[PDB]
Amino acid sequence: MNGLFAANDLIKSRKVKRRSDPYYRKKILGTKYKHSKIGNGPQAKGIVLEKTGVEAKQPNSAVRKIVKIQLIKTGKKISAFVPHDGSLNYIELNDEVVVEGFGKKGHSCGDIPGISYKVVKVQNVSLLALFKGKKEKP
Amino acid sequence: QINIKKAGKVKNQTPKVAKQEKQRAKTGRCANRRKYEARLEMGYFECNGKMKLNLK
RNA sequence: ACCAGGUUGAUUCUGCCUGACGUAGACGCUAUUCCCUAAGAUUAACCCAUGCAUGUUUUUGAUAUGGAAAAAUGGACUGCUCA
RNA sequence: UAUCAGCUAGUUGUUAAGGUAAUGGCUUAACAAGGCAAUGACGGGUAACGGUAUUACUUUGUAAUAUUCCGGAGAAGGAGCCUGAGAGACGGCUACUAAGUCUAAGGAUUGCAGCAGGGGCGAAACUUGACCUAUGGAUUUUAUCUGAGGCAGUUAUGGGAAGUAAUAUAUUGUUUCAUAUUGUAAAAGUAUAUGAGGUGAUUAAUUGGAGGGCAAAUCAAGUGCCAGCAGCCGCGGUAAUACUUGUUCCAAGAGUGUGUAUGAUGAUUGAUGCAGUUAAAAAGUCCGUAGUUUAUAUUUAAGAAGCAAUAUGAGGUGUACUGUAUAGUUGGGAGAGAGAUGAAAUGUGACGACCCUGACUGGACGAACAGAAGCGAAAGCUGUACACUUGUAUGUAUUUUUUGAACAAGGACGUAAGCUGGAGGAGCGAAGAUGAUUAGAUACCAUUGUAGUUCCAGCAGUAAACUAUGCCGACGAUGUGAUAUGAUAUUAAUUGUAUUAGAUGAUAGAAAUUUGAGUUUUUUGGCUCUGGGGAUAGUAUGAUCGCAAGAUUGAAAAUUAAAGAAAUUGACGGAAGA
RNA sequence: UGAAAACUACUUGAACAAUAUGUAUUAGAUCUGAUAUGUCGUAACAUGGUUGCUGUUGGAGAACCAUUAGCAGGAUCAUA
RNA sequence: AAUUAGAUCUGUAACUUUGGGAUAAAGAUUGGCUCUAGCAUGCUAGAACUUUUACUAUGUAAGGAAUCUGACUGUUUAUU
RNA sequence: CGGCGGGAGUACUAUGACUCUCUUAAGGUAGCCAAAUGCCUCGUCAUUUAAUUGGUGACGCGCAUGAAUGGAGCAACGA
Numbered sequence A: 001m002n003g004l005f006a007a008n009d010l011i012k013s014r015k016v017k018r019r020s021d022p023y024y025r026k027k028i029l030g031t032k033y034k035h036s037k038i039g040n041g042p043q044a045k046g047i048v049l050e051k052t053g054v055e056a057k058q059p060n061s062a063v064r065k066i067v068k069i070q071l072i073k074t075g076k077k078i079s080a081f082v083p084h085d086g087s088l089n090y091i092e093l094n095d096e097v098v099v100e101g102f103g104k105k106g107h108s109c110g111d112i113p114g115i116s117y118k119v120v121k122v123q124n125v126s127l128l129a130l131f132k133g134k135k136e137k138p
Numbered sequence B: 001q002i003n004i005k006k007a008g009k010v011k012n013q014t015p016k017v018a019k020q021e022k023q024r025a026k027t028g029r030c031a032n033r034r035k036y037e038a039r040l041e042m043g044y045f046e047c048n049g050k051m052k053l054n055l056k
Numbered sequence C: 001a002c003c004a005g006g007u008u009g010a011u012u013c014u015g016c017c018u019g020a021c022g023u024a025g026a027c028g029c030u031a032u033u034c035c036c037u038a039a040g041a042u043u044a045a046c047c048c049a050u051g052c053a054u055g056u057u058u059u060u061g062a063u064a065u066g067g068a069a070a071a072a073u074g075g076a077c078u079g080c081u082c083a
Numbered sequence D: 001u002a003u004c005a006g007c008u009a010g011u012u013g014u015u016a017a018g019g020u021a022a023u024g025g026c027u028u029a030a031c032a033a034g035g036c037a038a039u040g041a042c043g044g045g046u047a048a049c050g051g052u053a054u055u056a057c058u059u060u061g062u063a064a065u066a067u068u069c070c071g072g073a074g075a076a077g078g079a080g081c082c083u084g085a086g087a088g089a090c091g092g093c094u095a096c097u098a099a100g101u102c103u104a105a106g107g108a109u110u111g112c113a114g115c116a117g118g119g120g121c122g123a124a125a126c127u128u129g130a131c132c133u134a135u136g137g138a139u140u141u142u143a144u145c146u147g148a149g150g151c152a153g154u155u156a157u158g159g160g161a162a163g164u165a166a167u168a169u170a171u172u173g174u175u176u177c178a179u180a181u182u183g184u185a186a187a188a189g190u191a192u193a194u195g196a197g198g199u200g201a202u203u204a205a206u207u208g209g210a211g212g213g214c215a216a217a218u219c220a221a222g223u224g225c226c227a228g229c230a231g232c233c234g235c236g237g238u239a240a241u242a243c244u245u246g247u248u249c250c251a252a253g254a255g256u257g258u259g260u261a262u263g264a265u266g267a268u269u270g271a272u273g274c275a276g277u278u279a280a281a282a283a284g285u286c287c288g289u290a291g292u293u294u295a296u297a298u299u300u301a302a303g304a305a306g307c308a309a310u311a312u313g314a315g316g317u318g319u320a321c322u323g324u325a326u327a328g329u330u331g332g333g334a335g336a337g338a339g340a341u342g343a344a345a346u347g348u349g350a351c352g353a354c355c356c357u358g359a360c361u362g363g364a365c366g367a368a369c370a371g372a373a374g375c376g377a378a379a380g381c382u383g384u385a386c387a388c389u390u391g392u393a394u395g396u397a398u399u400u401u402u403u404g405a406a407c408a409a410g411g412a413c414g415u416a417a418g419c420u421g422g423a424g425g426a427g428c429g430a431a432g433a434u435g436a437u438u439a440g441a442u443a444c445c446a447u448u449g450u451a452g453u454u455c456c457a458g459c460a461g462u463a464a465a466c467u468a469u470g471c472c473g474a475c476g477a478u479g480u481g482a483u484a485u486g487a488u489a490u491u492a493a494u495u496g497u498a499u500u501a502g503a504u505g506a507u508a509g510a511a512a513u514u515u516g517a518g519u520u521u522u523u524u525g526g527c528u529c530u531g532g533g534g535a536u537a538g539u540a541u542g543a544u545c546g547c548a549a550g551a552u553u554g555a556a557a558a559u560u561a562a563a564g565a566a567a568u569u570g571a572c573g574g575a576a577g578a
Numbered sequence E: 001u002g003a004a005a006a007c008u009a010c011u012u013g014a015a016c017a018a019u020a021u022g023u024a025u026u027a028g029a030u031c032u033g034a035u036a037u038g039u040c041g042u043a044a045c046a047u048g049g050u051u052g053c054u055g056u057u058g059g060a061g062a063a064c065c066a067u068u069a070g071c072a073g074g075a076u077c078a079u080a
Numbered sequence F: 001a002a003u004u005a006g007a008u009c010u011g012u013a014a015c016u017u018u019g020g021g022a023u024a025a026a027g028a029u030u031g032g033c034u035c036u037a038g039c040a041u042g043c044u045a046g047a048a049c050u051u052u053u054a055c056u057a058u059g060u061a062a063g064g065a066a067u068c069u070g071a072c073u074g075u076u077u078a079u080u
Numbered sequence G: 001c002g003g004c005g006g007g008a009g010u011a012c013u014a015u016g017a018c019u020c021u022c023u024u025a026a027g028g029u030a031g032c033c034a035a036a037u038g039c040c041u042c043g044u045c046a047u048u049u050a051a052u053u054g055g056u057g058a059c060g061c062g063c064a065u066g067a068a069u070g071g072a073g074c075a076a077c078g079a
């Protein structure tokens, strides 16, 4: 298809080959509006229901502490990972949390299986500061 | 049959020693001045950075 | 006008993941000045308490020495939002 | 966007009239059959207001642009109209639908996508403040109005000019304090000057990190696969520079990090500019329309047609004959085992096998010659004689004059099984049933046994259908061969054209290998088809084919740091030789 | 037409019902595949103990067996 | 017992043994008088006027969605 | 013409792919169901209704279903 007067056959052929790009295919179908887990935003809110732990994959061995919540914007149930040592003792049930993502394009990183979200705020108190000990929990 | 009772075992167990107050650290171009004269005396520019700075 | 780490007892390739760097929104911690510049667009073009944003003019002169009405002239511009 | 290929009936045109400020199927009579499409009509989706001033990144240009300015549309949703130079107007009127509010119960009434402000929604966004100072509008705008428009308050939205010390404990003297003038619609604030007091451990610096990428500690104390850290690789088993605390060091600095989109890194979208034998990738093979493209000194090569040698060829189709062997019927002779396995067993024979003989009937197939030899578009093609029919190549003063290459739509052929109908059935033989081996065998071994494999008439369309190498065109190193045929030459040779086998060098390649897989980062002669990390998966769903089995087209949600190609060193073999 | 109130006929036409259809989204008894984490065998890799592998047609707890055609990516580039 | 029913014009689904389902379902029109227009000369289209509005004296299908069983046309206990 | 069994252990509970065992001619395969075929029985779940021993769709250790004594199946047709 190399010719001087072949612009009509060149554009029609190169649009077909571009559809096999795995990043461009999701842009056409619009999957980020259809199958989004959290919506379209940086954070979210929720209500805690359980305080349970999971076990990491081989070859490491530990117990990772998580929490099963229910979102407000959509209404679905989801699990999030408590990201610091000794931080679950602040958390009580029937409370509110704020959820932030991991930063690996919608996948799970580390040896934590099937979980892609982590807690950042409890009762409008920063959990990063509360581990440092600057504030106190009401 | 999963235990969550051992949450926060290590950090509450290690004993706390207090901080030691330090002089007020200089800030600004004088902070860059104290760092430049300290590097020039040990020949840090001549050996092309091949030494240990934090020595303890 | 620049690339690095990861498949093997060791080697050379194809191939992808990750690090380093921009542009718009939200968030954590900490803040002494001065000048410039911005602030309910993203979901709900969803519902509104209260107060205020369009009147001028001897053209005649209200049993009235300067204002009643009637006439004349503009309210179709300007401002707000993106269904 | 083809998992949207046909669509349109006031729709296309002619004549005539009405209506408008005006052209016009803009509306209405009569007549006619037109109008648009693979250069994508007609449909479906948008988390779609169009340009522009302005930002990035760049070797011919891409991406963002609610934000400054120009243009278009709407005032809860729809429709209709008055006044008027200009409204299908909403801080103008009428009706219906969805929401309401006041009442003495007869009735009356409201549109904050105008400025403040409240409610809901959310991860997410400010004073129910003063004023006509400057720029403007309202038919002369020096005094009327102006929530248009200015002037101030709240906020880490960003960009600038700067601070937190300097000279050697001491000296001098920047901010945190106040006051005049200038200024303001009136008040701030900025600038110029002036006052006091005495401090840089001060009123005056934080955020992240210290195994590699990646600048900086094998520093100390606790805990022992626990608690925990880590974008990827990876640390934690009583001496951890890789978790918790404490000391010290590094990077940026009035800022510093965490996170969701979206660009660059990317020569992993390749026009410049990727790859298609073996890593993902050339439809099973030909014919042929739209689109793409072309040898020319404008008159001629090539192409197509046609002769000679009736050269050469398991090319195809149909009638007539023929070859031994296996199996069966039968006439003679004779009288115990025949047949198979590593070794045996069931089965089989005195109603006489097995062997040597004499005659017959049927079905399948052409041994040895038989090759790195021939023909065919591919799948394929070996007994003889005739009939019909067909290729490529070599020679040559034969006709015509550019008729060419490759191909979306369409068409034909296509081993082996498998289907419906009729013919036939010697050997072989899935399924089924028995005898041994075995812990177990429904498998390998052996004995039986049906469909099938044979012929005619049709459907069906899949293979490791492989040279795993699409088709056309120009140039290339020697040596030994093979098929056809012409010239020189003559019994002794060396030479022309078209195919084809192999060896040694030379190039190219990641390498094995290699006359193309060469003429390439010093990348371009023309044209069709296919691939973008593994797995889910050639799986679901829709459409088109088929008597059926099934065939072509062909995703996603949830997952995962590898999967893979060529080649060296070991180890192993119920592998082979010396 | 009518003194007017009003009656009659065309035009634009909001709203309310009955059905046909197009685009999204979502409950459901039962219940198919797939991914992430002990029991019974030994299909594949050496001639993996019956050499492997594609295509079709039948069997079966399970990998998988068996008839027929093909390929070397084989255990042979090779002996009148 | 009641509703539907004749004739003309539009329109017609799931399923399928590809013939059917189907006259599916669902809508609209119908008198009298005076004319115009075709050619086949007794049939069919259109127009104007008018009314206590038109197949209906007699004759004339209620419709749709599912399950069990028999393939269909046919025959049989003269008198339960 | 006819016929087509029973008991024991074995992978937090639970179940038994797998194994052992009495006999016999062979031990109901492909299919189908509380059906005109299911005693207990007005079986269990869903749906139809204000309310259902009725109707329809799923489940199966089926008193006593099952292959020309034919099994599975509804397009056309039915006082």
Ligand SMILES: [Mg+2]
Binding pocket: A103
């Ligand atoms: Mg990141």
Ligand SMILES: [Mg+2]
Binding pocket: none
């Ligand atoms: Mg809005």
Ligand SMILES: [Mg+2]
Binding pocket: C070
């Ligand atoms: Mg007045």
Ligand SMILES: [Mg+2]
Binding pocket: none
């Ligand atoms: Mg919008």
Ligand SMILES: [Mg+2]
Binding pocket: none
């Ligand atoms: Mg929009």
Ligand SMILES: [Mg+2]
Binding pocket: none
């Ligand atoms: Mg007309």
Ligand SMILES: [Mg+2]
Binding pocket: D065
């Ligand atoms: Mg724009």
Ligand SMILES: [Mg+2]
Binding pocket: none
């Ligand atoms: Mg509103």
Ligand SMILES: [Mg+2]
Binding pocket: none
């Ligand atoms: Mg307006």
Ligand SMILES: [Mg+2]
Binding pocket: none
């Ligand atoms: Mg308007």
Ligand SMILES: [Mg+2]
Binding pocket: D090
């Ligand atoms: Mg209006």
Ligand SMILES: [Mg+2]
Binding pocket: D091, D112
């Ligand atoms: Mg308003």
Ligand SMILES: [Mg+2]
Binding pocket: D112
């Ligand atoms: Mg407002």
Ligand SMILES: [Mg+2]
Binding pocket: D125
């Ligand atoms: Mg904000």
Ligand SMILES: [Mg+2]
Binding pocket: none
């Ligand atoms: Mg620190």
Ligand SMILES: [Mg+2]
Binding pocket: none
């Ligand atoms: Mg270093």
